[PDB]
Write a protein that binds this DNA or RNA. Structure first.
Ligand SMILES: [Mg+2]
Ligand SMILES: [Zn+2]
Lengths: 333, 225, 90, 56, 697, 296, 83, 231
RNA sequence: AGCGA
């Protein structure tokens, strides 16, 4: 309202100013009620999704696992701590070891990786560690123990009967409610965004992504844009057909300029794209990283601490099945 | 070192409320003594009060009496403000009869021996030509606060009207201190306490009873060897 | 909201169990012949209430003999010491 | 969800449940296969130690 | 309470037949379109799942014969504000342009400053020159409802908490004393005499005869009239409805005058609570997170107490075996409990009853059922009659007591209207005097609700330097983050009104007091004051009044200009190191009392088709251990407790009695069987020609 | 206490009716079970003394709907309370999302030995401190207790009884041989609770730097002595934490307290964590009273 | 380890119990089965003597069998085999 | 209606824990705080008031010939238990030549005054230093700050110190809610008294009770025939 | 059908 109100509640509001405040008050309250319904519904669905993730074995004894960002490098050159480490690194078990400058091992395989040890790694001057996760646990039915890392409730290693799937369900779906969406209007971020991301519904505001590296063939067509990717091998130019001018180009590091070299799956515009497409381009690893980073982006935006292993359980449940394109000669439609 | 033991002087202000002054007192102590005495007077001075009544024309408490302006529960609330002092511990009964129009003051009550009413001028009810109020009041000793004892717990009849009882003769207590604290370290506190009783017993008697009460619970800690 | 007025009382079940235990105890307190006669008279052994002729037949005596037995035993039972442990069960 | 269709097509397939999940052991009231229900913990043999047994 | 009686009327409901149910009544219709101003209050609306669907009519609103809502306005011609009150609907409101009442009118109909605040058609807000204004608001507080209009200093409170306060002001309960509030609005007298629950002298005259039952008025022309009272009548929510007269036999009354106070009324005006001494300091954590602490003085002096009346009923009806009889010849029961019953069943009036006592001796035929041998021999030994008429007398339900006010008995013998197959209907009215107990709900007039954490003795309470204990202690942390300092201003102004002031205008009038009304330059102790909602006490005026607050009895200005005072800790003894806010605040006792909520069940009634325990405090029932609770248990991994809660506490029909037997005998709990809903499910599936079977391996 | 909870006796007497029935039959107070049941119904006063005995060491569950997450249900040891309102420990309010504006809770009752063990070991309050989500403490002191601890540990320059080294005419007049002496001087109107003084401690562990300075490697505290320039309030605040914990000497912001409790839970046993959080609660309330946080 | 003495429901300290067994779920079943053995011992004392034995540690005046079992666990007076 | 009791749990040689139970709600707070203040400010004791030292006139940082510094010596002497009978301020001397550790037995007391922990470290001397310090000790009550020197330079070497006259060091208390049902919520008082090794907490508490009973018999002796609460 | 969190 462009008036705007100009009286503190100590001074006592005037009639019209109070009448204006009533709008926002009632709107917020009704939104609270409806969103509470929605969040309960999301928790309901997730619980059934992750009802069968229960720790069975003590150790799957694999060697695959994810890498963690863990205090990326400074330009002038230091170890500036990554702000979101407590959610992404702690309570994890290493599959590999920490060695640097052909030196000695720092942390050996399979350690809880708590505060003293992270302090040791940052002192020694390493940035990336390959750590286990529930995404690559090789057990048949449910995760092993060492993949799930420290149980965030006990402070000790998770037990061999825990229903970590439902624990993650409640942790993810509990801190809804206090989840007011973004202040901005076509922009979409909030509990609806979380819901669509888990639902895998192609985001309504799809932001086209790349398909191969090379420089960009940029053009501003009739009342909207026309982009194309120049291949490098090359091959067929992926020509992006209609790109409405109601969007923006992606700014990173500078705005997207013509001739700039793009990645294989670089996001061309600014927005979001279908996890289906980023799958078919950059594989299960990239989709899992994308999903965890996106969801944690919202929960960070509201300043809520959720360890990434819960989301990892859920996405592990997401990425189980495969599709049959050729039957071979056996029983698969 | 001060080797002078404290005294206690008095100051009468009105008939019912008075001031007590105690000096000298070792520093950092007057507030504590004042609070202890206050908690004593305002909690555990034995007194007496009306416990139950019985109006002839009523069967219970939530009814009306023909003729009187007020109702039975309003009468209950009015008598609950009564102040009475007994002498013996057996529950005694005082009567009240009134016929015809007029206000019904506490002075119309005829008490038996030992018990006395300390304010005849209280408005209890008001009557008219059709009015007729006849009621008995059980008066009992005790201390502190007690809710209304149950009819079924006792062997009372249906005409009994229990009433919550407040055995306390003190109305308001306060105090202050004037700590001299001269730099030469001959420091001493001066407790100036103020009592206001509800015309039941003199403040002197109230404080004397409190002082007696604050010898028992410390005889506990004293009697060891 | 349809209360099952006819249903398990959930207390009278165990109450009757303990009742029966107490009756077996009290009957053991008395003479064995008297106890068996009462059990057959009131059907405590099979649920079939045996009557004076049947019990006199199974004991090889006369129905008036057993009626005297029954009257004396019931008079013994009405004596409060044998009934203080049963009075509260009503 | 889609209860009618799920039940009917399951009936055609004669698809037998193995009750290996959780909500099913909740529905039939049997011990759930999580926490203190899994056989690693539900079949614990507990006995007094021989030394203290002799001392008893 | 009378306010709720008023406010349930005038209520606007958008859900109904030919209306939008909550399924279709989405958010879109729940907002406050700018056309609601003066026609529908934006504040009051239920906080539940009806926000905006149910509102209340504005104060000055009127109904267009065509069902629209007209609103009064003061028309202004060529900058001269007339008094011709024209009623406009929303269409004409949009057409024309509307000014504000709180504008500088220069005692001639003429505005002062040309740039005047005004509203345009689309809800826009502008500064029009003072020539185009053709309509101006009749007054402030035109956009507010009835109940909300009674909240003092409303303009300081946030909309959310003001809405809460309005929704709780209707939930007070009638106390036995009903003292009027110190600080109020104008809407305590009008919203009282228009509520209906106050007797009003129809036409002027003098008083002939007064009583606790009736008042006889002698009109100036011959005729007399007897106003009958309503003493101890039960309301629709079990609260008292006593009416007590306020006049004297010799008084003269005029038409339209209050003549007898109603339930929550005092000397004519609304009294929804009591004026209590309040301190705003956090005390020993007991007032942690909206909790409240009271003194034992409220318990003792009966300041907060509510009379409650419950209605029990029973019908002697016809049956197949015969006819039911109300009587005294009940089956096995000692004559000890038959002392209260009258010669012919029902209890004597006034006899105190406890839970489980008898009220109506009533017996009904049971026919012939062969007895178990054990009870047969018990009857043989104890000489007890079969009493073929089983007994289902009226027993007062669990956890209730109190006196028996009235007994209303009907009969077929009196040829009263009874339904078919019913011989004799009787109702008994029990009553109790519920005193304020920890866990009850108290609230101010600003939505600052709270349960009672604890009732301390009177000595362990922060008392002033004058020995006067504070009566309730609110929490500080709830004030700033809830944006309802209206309570703080109310506290300060209440202390001012309680002590009485005197602005010493020795040299003219002080700066702050220039625009105060006359006869506000001084006031008496316990003097009542009112601040209309949107034109009320200014902050400077409050500072000025608090500055001079003439002393109580000695020379002691207990509360300084700041509005705080030095409290002494009643418990330890030392003075608090910082001054603490104290004042007089008006608070109300809400209808959410612990006695009406506490509930328990060990074993009670059971459902019919499913064998689950019943539900509701009307019955015993148990608590629905719902799906999310199941999830919590699974996450913990407490499989055995889950099994227990879902098999042998709810549905294992043969397992429940075995568990009870084991518990009484001291044995172990048995292993659960199979749930009953599961077997029901199996039987329906097999009824659907679906072969469901259990397979071993 | 953290593992305790209130319970209105007129509710427990119904919850544990079979247990109290059995026990007061055992004590010969009732000839049989039915008479014992009638005794419980009529509430003859000895039923309460037997009720205490049945209640002792028998946990109950406290559900609050809506049960958003795993800590919606927790197991407490019940204790009998006058009145009709369940007394809930203030420090599970965070877990239950329960403000005292009139919310209601459900008391359940485990029966079998297995259920009692599950409640005792898994669902006990003191055994569930941290979040299942991020491991942060939810028994962490909040709101009013945080205010109290802030006022206790904050430092005011230019306060009464500071340590100044001014000399020539008089000594420093800031040193204090023991926190007992400091407390006595605080009871007297000399020492403010938030003045900067130099105390000589013997029962608290100095920070790492002072430890490595004075003792180097193995300075044990219970006998060693060391001086520290801190505030009396902070000494009283470090008295609550266990002995092994170093000194803190900071201003107790909520984040600082969260860090302290997190470190304590990760390094020390759960029972120690429970006792220290209880002590923090008590101190927080007691010194929130004195802070004089009012609104005028 | 210098904790203050526990009291009531929390004696013995659970952390000093968890070192005896693998996980708290094993602890739970361990204690529950021992408590059931104790209850059976108290029920089967009137008749002849059978395999059951206990309580092995001296109980209190009126102490619950589950508490007795947990104190026995803390005393290191039993053993168990998992599944 | 009931007689309260008193029992102690001896924790250390001088550190006790008294329990009084049960009382009338609320008497625990009525008497616990009063008892605390009595314990802390009514038991007569004695202590050092000031000290003068050779070799130090204005360099109040360190003493020549020793290791420890002036304030350390001061606050070591401050924690020194002594008993006295002579009311006037008496003077003691502790003097020692040579390097070594000066203990609390080095001081030679005059008639009447005594030290209750002679085996206590105070100072260290090095390289044939001689430390000679004069103590002035007197008896009093409660606690006094470091009294400012009333004289300007009557004793130029005399520098004042605090004086811990109170024998007991640290007393707290709390209340409980024992037996709410059949007694209707009585109270229970717990005390945690700590004292130096001059007197036992038992005797300290008994003497405090004596002082308090006298102080309240002062009030009692107004109308001796006054009825109150009797047990 | 109405209502509280
Ligand atoms: Mg709430
Ligand atoms: Zn794994």
């Amino acid at each position: 309202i462009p008036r705007p109100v100009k009286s503190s509640f100590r001074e006592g509001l005037t009639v019209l100013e109070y009448f204006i405040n009533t709008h926002g008050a009632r709107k917020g309250l009704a939104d609270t009620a409806l969103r509470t319904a929605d969040s309960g519904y999301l928790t309901r669905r997730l619980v059934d999704v992750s009802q069968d993730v229960i720790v069975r074995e003590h150790d799957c004894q694999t060697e695959r696992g994810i890498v963690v960002e863990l205090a990326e490098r400074a330009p002038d050159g230091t170890l500036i701590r990554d702000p979101y480490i407590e959610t992404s690194a702690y309570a994890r078990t290493l599959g590999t070891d920490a060695v640097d400058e052909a030196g000695n091992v720092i942390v050996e395989r399979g350690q809880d990786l708590g505060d003293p040890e992270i302090d040791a790694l940052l002192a020694a001057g390493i940035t990336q560690v390959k750590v286990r996760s529930v995404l690559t646990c090789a057990t048949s039915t449910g995760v092993c123990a060492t993949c799930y890392g420290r149980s965030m409730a006990t402070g000790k290693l998770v037990d061999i009967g825990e229903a970590v799937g439902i624990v993650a369900a409640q942790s993810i779906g509990e801190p809804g409610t206090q989840l007011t969406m973004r202040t901005f209007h076509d922009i979409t971020g909030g509990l609806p965004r979380v819901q669509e991301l888990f639902e895998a519904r192609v985001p309504r505001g799809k932001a086209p992504i790349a398909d191969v590296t090379g420089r960009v063939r940029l053009e501003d067509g009739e009342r909207f844009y026309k982009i194309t990717i120049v291949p490098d091998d090359g091959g067929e130019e992926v020509v992006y057909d209609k790109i409405s001018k109601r969007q923006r180009l992606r700014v990173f590091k500078r705005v997207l300029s013509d001739g700039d070299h793009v990645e294989v799956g670089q996001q061309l515009m600014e927005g979001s794209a279908d996890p289906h497409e980023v799958l078919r381009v950059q594989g299960p690893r990239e989709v899992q990283i994308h999903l965890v980073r996106e969801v944690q982006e919202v929960y960070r935006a509201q300043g809520v601490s959720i360890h990434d292993k819960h989301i990892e359980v859920i996405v592990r449940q997401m990425l189980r099945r495969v599709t049959i394109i050729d039957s071979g000669s056996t029983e698969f439609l | 070192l001060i080797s002078q033991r404290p005294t206690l002087s008095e100051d009468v202000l009105t008939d019912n409320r008075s001031q007590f002054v105690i000096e000298p007192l070792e520093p950092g102590f007057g507030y504590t003594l004042g609070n202890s005495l206050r908690r004593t007077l305002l909690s555990s001075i034995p007194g007496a009060a009306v416990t139950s009544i019985r109006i002839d024309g009523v069967l219970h408490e939530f009814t009306t009496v023909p003729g009187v302006k007020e109702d039975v529960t309003e009468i209950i609330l009015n008598l609950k403000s009564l102040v009475v002092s007994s002498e013996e511990d057996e529950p005694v009964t005082m009567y009240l009869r009134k016929q015809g129009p007029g206000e019904v003051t506490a002075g119309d009550i005829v008490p038996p021996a030992g018990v006395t009413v300390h304010n005849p001028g209280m408005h209890i009810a008001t009557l008219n030509d059709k009015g007729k109020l006849e009621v008995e009041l059980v008066v009992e000793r005790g201390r502190g606060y007690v809710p209304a004892v149950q009819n079924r717990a006792s062997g009372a009849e249906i005409g009994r009207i229990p009433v919550d009882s407040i055995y306390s003769p003190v109305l308001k207590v306060t105090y202050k201190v004037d700590a001299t604290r001269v730099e030469q370290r001959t420091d001493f506190d001066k407790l100036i306490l103020d009592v206001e009783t509800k015309n039941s017993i003199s403040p002197r008697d109230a404080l004397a009873s409190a002082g007696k009460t604050l010898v028992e619970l410390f005889g506990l800690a004293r009697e060891l060897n | 909201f349809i209360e099952d007025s006819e249903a398990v009382v959930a207390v009278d079940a165990v109450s009757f169990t303990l009742l029966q235990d107490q009756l077996q105890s009290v009957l053991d307190t008395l003479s064995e012949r008297e106890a068996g006669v009462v059990r057959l008279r009131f059907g405590l052994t099979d649920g079939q209430p045996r009557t004076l002729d049947e019990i006199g037949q199974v004991y090889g005596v006369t129905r008036e003999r057993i009626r005297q037995i029954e009257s004396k035993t019931m008079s013994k039972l009405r004596h409060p010491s044998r009934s203080q442990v049963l009075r509260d069960y009503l | 969800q889609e209860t009618t269709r799920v039940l009917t097509d399951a009936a055609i397939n004669c698809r037998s449940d193995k009750l290996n999940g959780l909500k099913e052991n909740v529905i039939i009231g049997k011990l759930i296969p999580a926490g203190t229900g899994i056989n690693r913990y539900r079949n614990i043999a507990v006995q007094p130690t021989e030394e203290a047994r002799a001392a008893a | 309470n009378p306010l709720s009686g008023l406010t349930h009327k005038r209520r606007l409901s958008a859900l109904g037949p030919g209306g939008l149910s909550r399924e279709r009544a989405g958010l879109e219709v729940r907002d406050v379109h700018p056309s609601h101003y003066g026609r529908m209050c934006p504040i009051e609306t239920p906080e539940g799942p009806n926000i905006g669907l149910i509102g209340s009519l504005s104060v000055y609103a009127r109904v267009n014969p065509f069902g629209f809502i007209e609103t009064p306005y003061r028309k202004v011609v060529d900058g001269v504000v007339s008094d011709e009150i024209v009623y406009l609907t929303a269409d004409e409101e949009d057409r024309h342009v509307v000014a504000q009442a709180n504008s500088p009118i220069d005692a001639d109909g003429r505005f002062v400053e040309p740039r005047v605040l005004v509203r345009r058609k689309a809800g826009e807000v502008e500064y029009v020159p003072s020539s185009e204004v053709d309509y101006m608001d009749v007054s402030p507080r035109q956009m507010v409802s009835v109940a909300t209009a009674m909240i003092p200093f409303l303009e300081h409170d946030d909309a959310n908490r003001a809405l809460m306060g309005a929704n709780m002001q209707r939930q007070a309960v009638p106390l036995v004393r009903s003292e009027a509030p110190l600080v109020g609005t104008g809407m305590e007298l009008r919203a009282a005499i228009d509520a209906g629950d106050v007797v009003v002298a129809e036409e002027s005259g003098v008083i002939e005869e007064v009583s606790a039952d009736y008042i006889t008025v002698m009109h100036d022309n011959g005729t007399r009239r007897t106003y009958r009272m309503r003493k101890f009548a039960r309301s629709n929510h079990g609260t008292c409805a006593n009416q007590c007269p306020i006049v004297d036999a010799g008084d003269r009354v005029e038409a339209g005058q209050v003549i007898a106070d109603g339930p929550c009324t005092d000397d004519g005006e609304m009294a929804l609570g009591k004026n209590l001494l309040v301190a705003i300091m956090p005390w020993e954590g007991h007032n942690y997170e909206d909790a409240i602490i009271l003194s034992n003085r409220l318990v003792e002096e009966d300041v907060l107490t509510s009379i409650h009346i419950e209605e029990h009923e029973i019908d002697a009806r016809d049956t197949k075996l015969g006819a039911e009889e109300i009587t005294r010849d009940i089956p096995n029961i000692s004559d000890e409990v038959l002392a209260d019953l009258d010669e012919r069943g029902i209890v004597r009036i006034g006899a105190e009853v406890r839970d489980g006592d008898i009220l109506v001796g009533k017996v009904t035929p049971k026919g012939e059922t062969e007895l178990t041998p054990e009870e047969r021999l018990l009857r043989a030994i104890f000489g007890e009659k079969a009493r073929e008429v089983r007994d289902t007398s009226l027993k007062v339900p669990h956890g209730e007591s109190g006196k028996v006010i009235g007994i209303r008995v009907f009969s077929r013998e009196d040829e009263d209207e009874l339904p078919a197959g019913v011989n004799e209907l009787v109702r008994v009215y029990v009553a109790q005097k519920r005193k304020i107990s920890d866990g009850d709900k108290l609230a101010g007039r600003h939505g600052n609700k709270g349960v009672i954490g604890k009732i301390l003795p009177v000595e362990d309470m922060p008392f002033l330097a004058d020995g006067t204990p504070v009566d309730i202690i609110l929490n500080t942390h709830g004030v700033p983050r809830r944006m309802n300092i209206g309570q703080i201003l109310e506290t300060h102004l209440g202390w001012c009104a309680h002590s009485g002031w005197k602005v010493d205008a020795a040299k003219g009038v002080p700066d702050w007091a220039a625009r105060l009304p006359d006869e506000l330059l001084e006031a008496q102790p316990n003097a009542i004051v009112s601040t209309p909602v949107f034109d009320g006490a200014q902050e400077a005026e409050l500072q000025g009044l608090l500055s001079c607050t003439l002393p109580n009895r000695d020379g002691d200005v207990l509360v300084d200009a700041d509005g705080k005072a030095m409290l002494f800790d009643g418990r330890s003894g030392e003075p608090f190191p910082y001054p603490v806010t104290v004042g007089y605040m008006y608070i109300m006792k809400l209808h959410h009392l612990v006695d009406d909520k506490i509930h328990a069940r060990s074993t009670g009634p059971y459902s019919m088709i499913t064998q689950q325990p019943l539900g509701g405090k009307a019955q015993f029932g148990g608590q629905r251990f719902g799906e999310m609770e199941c999830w919590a248990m699974q996450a913990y991994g407490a499989a055995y407790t889950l099994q227990e809660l879902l098999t042998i506490k709810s549905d294992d029909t043969v397992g429940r009695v075995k568990v009870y037997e084991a518990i009484v005998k001291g044995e172990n709990i048995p292993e659960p069987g199979i749930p009953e809903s599961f077997k029901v499910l199996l039987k329906e599936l097999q009824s659907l020609c679906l072969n469901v079977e259990v397979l071993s391996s | 206490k953290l593992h305790q909870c209130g319970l209105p006796k007129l509710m427990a007497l119904e919850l544990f009716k079979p247990f109290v029935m059995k026990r007061l039959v055992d004590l010969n107070h009732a000839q049989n079970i039915k008479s014992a049941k009638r005794m419980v119904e009529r509430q003859r006063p000895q039923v309460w003394d037997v009720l205490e005995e049945v209640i002792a060491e028998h946990p109950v569950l406290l559900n609050r709907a809506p049960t958003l997450h795993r800590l919606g249900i927790q197991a407490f040891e019940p204790m009998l309370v006058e009145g009709k309102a369940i007394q809930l420990h203030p420090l599970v309010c965070e877990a239950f999302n329960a403000d005292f504006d009139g919310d209601q809770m459900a008391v359940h009752l485990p029966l079998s030995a297995e259920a009692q063990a599950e409640a005792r070991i898994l669902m006990l309050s003191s055994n569930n401190i941290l979040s299942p989500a991020s491991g942060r403490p939810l028994a962490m002191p909040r709101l009013d207790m945080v205010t109290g601890l802030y006022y206790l540990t904050t430092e005011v320059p230019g306060d009464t009884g500071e340590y100044q080294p001014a000399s020539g005419d008089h000594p420093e007049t800031g040193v204090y041989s023991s926190p007992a002496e400091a407390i006595m001087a605080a009871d007297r109107g000399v020492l403010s609770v938030r003045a900067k003084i130099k105390v000589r401690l013997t029962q608290l562990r100095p920070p790492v730097e002072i430890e490595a300075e004075l003792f180097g490697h193995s300075g044990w505290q219970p006998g060693d002595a060391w001086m520290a320039e801190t505030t009396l309030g902070r000494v009283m605040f470090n008295e609550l934490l266990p002995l092994g914990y170093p000194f803190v000497n900071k201003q107790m912001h909520k984040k600082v307290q969260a860090a302290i409790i997190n470190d304590l839970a990760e390094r020390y046993p759960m029972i120690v964590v429970a006792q220290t959080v209880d002590k923090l609660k008590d101190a927080g309330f007691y010194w929130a009273t004195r802070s004089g946080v009012t609104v005028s | 380890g210098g904790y203050d003495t526990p009291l009531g429901i929390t004696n013995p300290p659970i952390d000093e119990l968890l070192d005896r067994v693998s996980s708290k779920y094993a602890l739970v079943i361990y204690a529950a089965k021992r408590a059931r053995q104790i209850n059976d011992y108290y029920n089967q004392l009137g008749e002849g003597i059978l395999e059951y034995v206990g309580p092995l540690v001296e109980p209190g005046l009126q102490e619950k069998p589950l508490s007795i079992a947990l104190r026995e666990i803390h005393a290191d007076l039993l053993e168990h085999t998992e599944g």
